[PDB]
């Protein structure tokens, strides 16, 4: 026996009621944007019949910075490795993607935003990189992240490879800067509301306010479970492993 997961948006939802296009960045570290929880999300959003379009950005290519750290591969080649994760996500979540209809689905690959589908992205990164040099608030934000996640990653890797705490910090810094910059590419997709099962990335919020000069239309959502007559996903594996986790475990098998 098993309860049903339902999703609910946090705070006043008028921001959704006035929207026609909804965007969500799909993270490879989440467990909350796959399987039951994704289906839960799509179920809730379809209740807002003003939503004609949903955009999912698959955030996998972003991870090449960390995959390079692990593997020593060239960055584009680390990128191919990283894009295996997005293939895993697509294949794990066909049910949810096809359930959106008649709401139109747009799938966006991170690689398309960073490398063209122009010099649109490199221009966007320049703004983010200038901001890191010039804004002590943003510089501290980035530094704080790269120090924290530098540490987490070096301790993850110390026993299996020769690695420096400085190497890990650099990769984490470039990761965060790319992630911060992407919001400048998201606006090109014409979304009206952006959402996530948790708080919005602070890099993303900062860059948006600074260079658009408008409040970001973000709303989070949370999950709850209820007793129901017939509960779905009962044959689902009861193991909360992110796709990044599984792909790492996978790469340990081949050292």
Distances in Å between the alpha carbon of 185 and those of 35, 57, 104, 197? Answer: 27, 11, 20, 21
Domain boundaries, the chain: 1-255
Residue 244 has which token pair? 């990044």
CA–chain centroid gap for 83, Å, is 13
Query: 202-212 and 165-186 are packed helices; what angle lies between their axes, rounded to 10 degrees?
Result: 50
| Peptide bond just before 122 cis, omega within 30 deg | no
User: Which 3-state string (H, E, C) describes 17-58?
Assistant: HCCCEEEEEEECCCCCCCCHHHHHHHHHHCCCCCCCEEEEEE
Backbone angles phi, psi at 103, to 5 degrees: -60, 130
The answer to whether residues 122 and 184 touch, using CB atoms and an 8 Å cutoff, is no
Residue 32 has which token pair? 């909350």
The answer to whether residues 36 and 1 touch, using CB atoms and an 8 Å cutoff, is no
Give the side-chain half-sphere CA count within 13 A for 128.
Answer: 27
Q: Which residues pair with 107 in a beta bridge?
A: 56
Helix (H, G, I), strand (E, B) or coil at 13: coil
- The residue with tokens 């608030």 is 137
Whole-angstrom distance, CA of residue 153 vs CA of residue 155? 5
Q: Where are the alpha helices (DSSP H) in the chain?
A: 14-17, 36-45, 64-71, 75-92, 94-99, 110-115, 120-134, 136-157, 165-186, 202-212, 243-252
CA–chain centroid gap for 5, Å, is 21
The answer to whether residues 67 and 86 touch, using CB atoms and an 8 Å cutoff, is no
Dihedral, 67, 68, 69, 72 alpha carbons, nearest 10: 130
- The residue with tokens 């590419």 is 185
Whole-angstrom distance, CA of residue 40 vs CA of residue 45? 9
Whole-angstrom distance, CA of residue 179 vs CA of residue 107? 18
Helix (H, G, I), strand (E, B) or coil at 187: helix
- If you compute the radius of gyration of the chain from its CA atoms, what whole number of angstroms results? 19
- Determine the length of the chain: 255
The answer to whether residues 40 and 9 touch, using CB atoms and an 8 Å cutoff, is no
Whole-angstrom distance, CA of residue 93 vs CA of residue 212? 34
| DSSP 8-state class, residue 220 | E
Whole-angstrom distance, CA of residue 75 vs CA of residue 69? 9
Backbone angles phi, psi at 26, to 5 degrees: -90, 115
The answer to whether residues 32 and 197 touch, using CB atoms and an 8 Å cutoff, is yes
Dihedral, 196, 120, 62, 126 alpha carbons, nearest 10: -100
Helix (H, G, I), strand (E, B) or coil at 180: helix
CA nearest neighbour of 32 among 241, 181, 255: 241
Q: Quick one: residue 157, left, alpha or beta (phi over 0 = left, psi -120 to 50 = alpha)?
A: alpha
């Amino acid at each position: 026996y098993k309860k049903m997961k339902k999703a609910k948006f946090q705070g006043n939802v008028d921001i959704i009621k006035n929207a026609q296009c909804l965007l969500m960045g799909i993270s490879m570290n989440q467990t909350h944007q796959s399987g039951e929880e994704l289906y839960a999300f799509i179920n809730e959003i379809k209740k807002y019949t003003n939503i004609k379009k949903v955009i999912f950005v698959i955030t996998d290519y972003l991870h090449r910075h960390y995959v390079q750290l692990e593997t020593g591969l060239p960055l584009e080649e680390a990128g191919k490795e990283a894009e295996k994760m997005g293939e895993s996500w697509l294949q794990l979540n066909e049910a949810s993607l096809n359930s959106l209809s008649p709401v139109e689905l747009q799938l966006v690959q991170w690689k398309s935003l960073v490398e063209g589908s122009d010099t649109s992205y490199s221009d966007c990164l320049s703004k983010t990189e200038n901001c890191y040099r010039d804004d002590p608030f943003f510089q501290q934000m980035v530094d704080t992240y790269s120090n924290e996640f530098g540490q987490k990653h070096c301790n993850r890797l110390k026993n299996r490879i020769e690695i420096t705490l400085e190497a890990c910090q650099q990769a984490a810094k470039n990761y965060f800067l790319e992630e911060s910059t992407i919001i400048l590419k998201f606006i090109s997709l014409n979304f009206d509301v952006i959402t996530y099962p948790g708080k919005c990335n602070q890099g993303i919020n900062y860059i948006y306010n600074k260079y658009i000069g408008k409040p970001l239309n973000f709303i989070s959502y949370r999950f709850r479970s209820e007793h129901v007559k017939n509960s779905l996903f009962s044959f689902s594996k009861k193991t909360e492993e992110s796709i990044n986790d599984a792909h790492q475990f996978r790469r340990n098998i081949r050292s």
